[PDB]
From a paper:
CMP acts as the leaving group to give the cyclic diphosphate reaction product MEcDP. In the BsIspF/CMP complex, only four CMP moieties can be modeled in the six active pockets of the two trimers in the asymmetric unit with the occupancy higher than 0.7, one trimer fully loads CMP substrates, and the other captures only one. Although the two trimers in the asymmetric unit display extremely structural similarity (r.m.s.d: 0.20 Å), the B-factors of the active pocket in the two trimers are quite different, which may be the possible cause for this asymmetric binding. The CMP moieties reveal similar interactions with the protein. The cytidine group of CMP interacts with the residues Ala101, Pro104, Met106, and Leu107 through main-chain atoms, and the ribose hydroxyl groups form hydrogen bonds with the carboxylate of Asp57 and the amide of Gly59 from the adjacent subunits. Residues Thr133 and Thr134 hydrogen bond to the α-phosphate of CMP, waters act as a bridge between the α-phosphate and the magnesium ion. All these residues are highly conserved in the IspF protein. And, the overlay of each chain between the native and BsIspF/CMP complex reveal r.m.s.d values ranging from 0.12 to 0.24 Å. Moreover, structural comparisons show that only a small Cα r.m.s.d differences (~0.1 Å) occur in this region between BsIspF and BsIspF/CMP complex. In both native and CMP bonded structures of BsIspF, magnesium ions were refined in the active site, with the ingredient of magnesium ions used in the crystallization cocktail.
Residue numbers in the entry:
A (entry chain C), B (entry chain A), C (entry chain B): 1 to 158
């Protein structure tokens, strides 16, 4: 028994905020805006996992209206989600993720995001892939108004 | 033994159309524009299903020019597609879907969508997940010009 | 055992380039811009396959700045990627792909695309699905500024 999940998220890039993607703080002059730390990649990972076990989405579990979510660490949120997945009787098969951003260049941070995600999913780094693509200056990600992310996850009984 | 499918669709939001998403009519002052009822989520689910079995996309079976597509009920189209899947030997593993819309708030209608999708795929509600995200006012969805959806499906022999 | 991968890519449409998609030259008045042939779909497929086995993305294996990338045949880049996948001990389960493009109409070239991708992944055509959608004239794909593609792949031990 295998189950699939998919996640998609978008956050605005703005002046007065830290950039945290995949649990890793990137030195940058813009960061992501949200109620929590706005880590678009960990929200997308969390969404894919919840999706795979039929448990809705991060908004159902950590709504904005509740200020426990306010400035929440999304790695801790992911850990809570992974708790739900474990309770269903699953472990990670593998995950594959895409950061969609014109800038910054994510390549130097990728290996540390893979480790961090793997730690949050209680898995080996070889089960976690993270990649990045621009949109060649097209669309809202192309004009650097925001950063999007996608993930697909395969989980299995264990 | 297993196959994966992925679907993506976009419809314009316009005055004077009903809003039908996931087979559920949602009261709102705009609806989706199409030749059919323009149920962007059911079109996405149908496309993921057809994708999983190597049968093309909804346009190969129900082109815009087919008089049957005009005002077609997308749930019925989904049933037709699911008959194709079943003839190939497959049943639903699980499906995970995302509505990409700035508004309306999808949350109250999610559980009815899940039940309707599950009925179309002859499956338990536990096998179906639907979630929603905005794009934080960015891009065409952020301007409420349209609604998009994505789905990933895992099917298995049965 | 099974592994999942997901790809996404975008290239700009510009005058005075061939349009090559899914390894097929499509006669058209614009083509895709890149250092390589800029085949957005074969890039997307390659990234999905690399993702499935935890090997990063095409830029970690075939960076922009590599002279062999300049005017590269993306079918040959796919065959190399597929080499890596086989080296890790996997074969194709199935793959589902979507071209996102306002124009041209892809339908006539879809069957030749499927055969080419199946050849690239050492698979039967029945394991490969290629679809197209527009975005109803919305966003960068809808204004014909570029073409995007998505792919989800399921690979299996063999
Ligand atoms: N159109 C929408 C968009 C989001 N939602 C829900 O609201 C939450 C907040 O969405 P955003 O994070 O995109 O603002 C989501 O996690 C989802 O639970 C909704 O119910 N309808
Ligand atoms: N924001 C980004 C975008 C792309 N990249 C890298 O650059 C490579 C090529 O990306 P583009 O072709 O999208 O520009 C990617 O495969 C990825 O390795 C990155 O490291 N950070
Ligand atoms: N560029 C495109 C876009 C769509 N199509 C086909 O047209 C059909 C309908 O596309 P839209 O509803 O996205 O316009 C699709 O289901 C696909 O069969 C195509 O052949 N080439
Ligand atoms: Mg988020
Ligand atoms: Mg549609
Ligand atoms: Mg490319």
């Amino acid at each position: 028994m295998f189950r699939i999940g998919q996640g998609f998220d978008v956050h605005q890039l703005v002046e007065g905020r830290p950039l945290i993607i995949g649990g890793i703080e990137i030195p940058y002059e813009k960061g992501l805006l949200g109620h929590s730390d706005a880590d678009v990649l960990l929200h997308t990972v969390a969404d894919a996992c919840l999706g795979a076990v039929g448990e809705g989405d991060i908004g159902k579990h950590f709504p904005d209206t509740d200020p426990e979510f306010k400035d929440a660490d999304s790695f801790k949120l992911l850990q809570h989600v992974w708790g739900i997945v474990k309770q269903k009787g699953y472990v990670l098969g593998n995950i594959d993720c895409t950061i969609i951003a014109q800038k910054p260049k994510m390549l130097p941070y990728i290996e540390d995001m893979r480790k961090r995600i793997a730690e949050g999913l209680e898995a080996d780094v070889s089960q976690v892939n993270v990649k990045a693509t621009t949109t060649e200056k097209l669309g809202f990600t192309g004009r650097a108004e925001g950063i999007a992310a996608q993930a697909t996850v395969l989980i299995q009984k264990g």
